[PDB]
RNA sequence: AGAUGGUAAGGGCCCACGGUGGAUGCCUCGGCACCCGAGCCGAUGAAGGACGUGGCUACCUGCGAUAAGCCAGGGGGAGCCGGUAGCGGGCGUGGAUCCCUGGAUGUCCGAAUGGGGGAACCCGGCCGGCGGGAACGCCGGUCACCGCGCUUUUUGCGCGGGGGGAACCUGGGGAACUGAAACAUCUCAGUACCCAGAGGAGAGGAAAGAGAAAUCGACUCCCUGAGUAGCGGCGAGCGAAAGGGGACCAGCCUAAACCGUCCGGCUUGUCCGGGCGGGGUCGUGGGGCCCUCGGACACCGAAUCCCCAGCCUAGCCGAAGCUGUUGGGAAGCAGCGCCAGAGAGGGUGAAAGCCCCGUAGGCGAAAGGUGGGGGGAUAGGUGAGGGUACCCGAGUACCCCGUGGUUCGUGGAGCCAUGGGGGAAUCUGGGCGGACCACCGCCUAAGGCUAAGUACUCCGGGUGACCGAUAGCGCACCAGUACCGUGAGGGAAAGGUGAAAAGAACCCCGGGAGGGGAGUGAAAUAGAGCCUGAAACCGUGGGCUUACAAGCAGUCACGGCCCCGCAAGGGGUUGUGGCGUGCCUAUUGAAGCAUGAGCCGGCGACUCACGGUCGUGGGCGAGCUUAAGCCGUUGAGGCGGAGGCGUAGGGAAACCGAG
RNA sequence: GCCGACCCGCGAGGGCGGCUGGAGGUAAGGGAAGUGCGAAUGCCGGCAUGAGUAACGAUAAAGAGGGUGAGAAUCCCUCUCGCCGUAAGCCCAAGGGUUCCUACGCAAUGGUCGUCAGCGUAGGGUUAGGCGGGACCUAAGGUGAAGCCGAAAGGCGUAGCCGAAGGGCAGCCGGUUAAUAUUCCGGCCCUUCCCGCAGGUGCGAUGGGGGGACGCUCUAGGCUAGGGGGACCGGAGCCAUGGACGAGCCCGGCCAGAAGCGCAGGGUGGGAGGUAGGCAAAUCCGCCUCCCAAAAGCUCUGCGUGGUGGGGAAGCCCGUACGGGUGACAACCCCCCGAAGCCAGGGAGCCAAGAAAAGCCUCUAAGCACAACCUGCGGGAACCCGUACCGCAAACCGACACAGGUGGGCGG
């Protein structure tokens, strides 16, 4: 309950200290611990030589994790958050002024 | 022959490097205190457990043959299938999780309720259904006893009944220690606990009162009155009400008189009893009955009837920022800027009003629940007089006896309450004004109901000159768990990798265990019950010293050895010698062959409330100050003279009065 | 927190700097207190000391070989000795809960060990018409409509009901898995309830009686459980070292079983009449009179036997395991010994005077009389809880593989 957040998943730079100012996709919201997951914390993994799915070399990873309230908004700019406005009907929530929401698909 | 430094099994002393071990500091899903809101759960089967329940599943948690969940209503917008990772496979913008509501399933146990019983298992009567289904078996209904009201007694129909409860509340039972420096009488106390029951309150409740004034006007609550007045082996000590100021304000239903009516009987009779109805309610007393004035269109009108706003059971929008920069990390530092009905705070690799949640501000109910705030209705209430002589609460007042409560322990003992015995009256009837009598007042007994103001915290929300893992709830955590006892009962330990799992692939010795590199990142001296690592504590290396040596173990001086220091100084050490009866408690007096302590860490003891009392810091000054409460605030104060202290004392008292 | 030989304070402290560490800290001026520990045979915690010493559970005992494996005194295969043998062997309930069995495993748990194991891990295993128990009965006892009483809470408590290893009540032999087997398999024996066929009866009660049915001691005859000897039965072996093929040594030489057959014993006298007991309902028993008999019948049991299913050893072979074979067409006979057990309610004696209730036998009420009931044969149905594993001990009561204790049966 209240898990409400402000990261949608599609596409968000980053405001942070390691990967400070860089582009990231849809980020994968996960979950209701308050995580990211978007094209930033790329690291290699220490598993072992799992014979059929972790072959005879077993050093490797992907994406890794990291913390959701780091990343921040994008429009015809980049950051600035996002406002709501009940469109009396549905929702939008463009970026603060330049507008866009990002439900989008006939939002 | 003579002379004199020197070896260390091992010991001590110092520094350094470690190990056990946990202290500390700091953090905090816990707890704490109070304020405020809230306040009933059950036979429609509860509080509370048991067996289960998931595809792989011990616990938890949630739930129940439909078992981590079922259908509809609202919400809401991107995730979802729980903590607990994985296998595995689904969920959705034809809008899932989840929060709010209504109901569905709700096996077995607990008032347990067909019967039995050692709680959770074993039998059964009737009504019906499933198996070929009568023999065996399953399933839905129903089946204990209490009260009370109708039924033709009959069989029945019916509303209700039990168990629970954090604390408070009423009533029935009701100690002891302890105090009186003894101990009965008195204390503690009518307290603890036992029992009964009622409820958000309880209880209480309209005067047979108060109390002395032709004075007031249910009840509970606070303060004051007041440690006053009395009670008392006049000791312990216990300790009233009235008045005042405030909080809250509310008043009522019946019986008997008379009238009717249906029932019962009976010595039919202008009737003894009864069901129901009309009737009537009092303090200049009212009411009955007949007559007298005219009694009315109105006048009031809820505690009950209903409707709605407000209130809750989820949520929703929501003001303002960047670029460089040291650092693994910025919110820090610099530059320029912005918001504010919002500079509360939390987190975000650190310290942010403008990054994320959120604050101020504004909004929210299809279904449930709540509602005098206010509108409507409804039950019911409204008069002046005369006669009459009817009623006005009975085994009661009243008397006595044995007494409980009251300030009253037997007092001169009232009053209230009443266990035994006697034993009334109906407004010239009657209780009380503290023996008792006169009087004069006061109040109308022996039928019942009444909100609010007060109390209490299982519960939720807010706050803090409240604790930070021995403190704190016994329990921060898988605690009413382990384990101890048959038993009632007792009651532990136990937090913290990092910002993030990135929680260590590969080689190497080794059965493994555990290590040596790699590799991880800021940090691996953060390496997995791992932050920070005191001491006792046992090791390791090294610097000084000790194998002719008599000791509360050190102190002063002198000596050498080693390490520092530019000098002069200094530290570490101990060869010699001068000296030298451990610490505490208690004692006239002890090192004590008097007591207490193995050693280190943490806990651990003169407080507080009211009154009193000497001063002392101020303000006022023959004046000084308010308690309860009310208003305001969101750490904002302010009204509020009721009272207490003071202006005069003397005497037991009347009273006198600077005497 | 660690360190210090500097500075300041009379001191308690404070500053200082170095190292360590990682996000909290709070002056001057005031204020608030659970505030300053060395002791309390003080509370919790941790680590020494004695001391590498006491002890390492019965003095019934241990020796080797081979394997296993990183490792064997301590696990496993063999040989060797020794200690029990009214036990320390074998059951039974009680109690405890997975210890059992299989595969893997040793960090802790066994007073060392550890390749073992009651320890760890997953997997397996616990069958019932008949053994025990419940839809049967009662005991002493508890509860408990009614009755009574008590301030209450509660006490006694008739009927009723629960309540036992006591009653009664239907299953015995051998096989078989890694482990349960009176459960499953097979040879057989019988019980339960429904439907029908056939015969027969007045049926039929929780109500009446009969019965069950009972004490201690001595003890009867017969039978067996168990036990011994045999020239004889069957067989795989064996002559040693001085003798010997002797009736030589060694092995075993059965179990269950309906009808029927034989042996013993227990229960009981048949018939008639009347009855104002059984808290009348009676033909039933009690009872008063008669006839007959005392054998014997009737009857329940116990034994032996029986058609038949089943068993079967020493030795040796392989097999580590468990055992698979061997094991034979197997032998399965005779003389003796003799139960405390069986025939049960047997005989005798004694004084202490020796349960109750249902099954069952039975009489009728109410009522039914198509029914119901009894028998017989057939054909259908017969459930719910138990069992693994230890049980004179290491799993049970004693905090522990304690030398303690724990009722009964076999016990050569």
Same mark, same amino acid.
């Given at each position: 309950? =209240?898990?409400? &957040?402000?990261?949608?998943?599609?596409?968000?730079?980053?405001? @942070?200290?390691? #990967?400070?100012?860089?582009?990231?996709? =849809?980020?994968?919201?996960?979950?209701?611990? #308050? %995580?990211? /997951? =978007? $094209?930033?914390?790329?690291?290699?993994?220490? %598993?072992?030589? =799992?014979? +059929?799915? #972790?072959?005879?070399?077993?050093? /490797? $990873?992907?994406?890794? +994790?990291? &913390?959701? @309230? !780091?990343?921040?908004? /994008?429009?015809?700019?980049?950051? !600035?958050?996002?406002?709501?406005?009940?469109?009396?009907?549905?929702?939008?929530? !463009? /970026?603060?002024?330049?507008? !866009?929401?990002?439900?989008?698909?006939?939002?």
């Amino acid at each position: 309950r =209240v898990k409400m &957040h402000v990261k949608k998943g599609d596409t968000v730079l980053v405001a @942070s200290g390691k #990967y400070k100012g860089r582009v990231g996709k =849809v980020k994968e919201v996960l979950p209701k611990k #308050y %995580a990211v /997951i =978007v $094209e930033g914390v790329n690291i290699v993994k220490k %598993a072992v030589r =799992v014979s +059929p799915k #972790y072959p005879q070399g077993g050093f /490797i $990873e992907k994406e890794a +994790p990291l &913390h959701a @309230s !780091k990343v921040r908004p /994008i429009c015809p700019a980049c950051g !600035k958050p996002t406002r709501v406005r009940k469109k009396f009907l549905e929702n939008g929530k !463009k /970026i603060r002024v330049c507008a !866009k929401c990002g439900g989008a698909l006939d939002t």
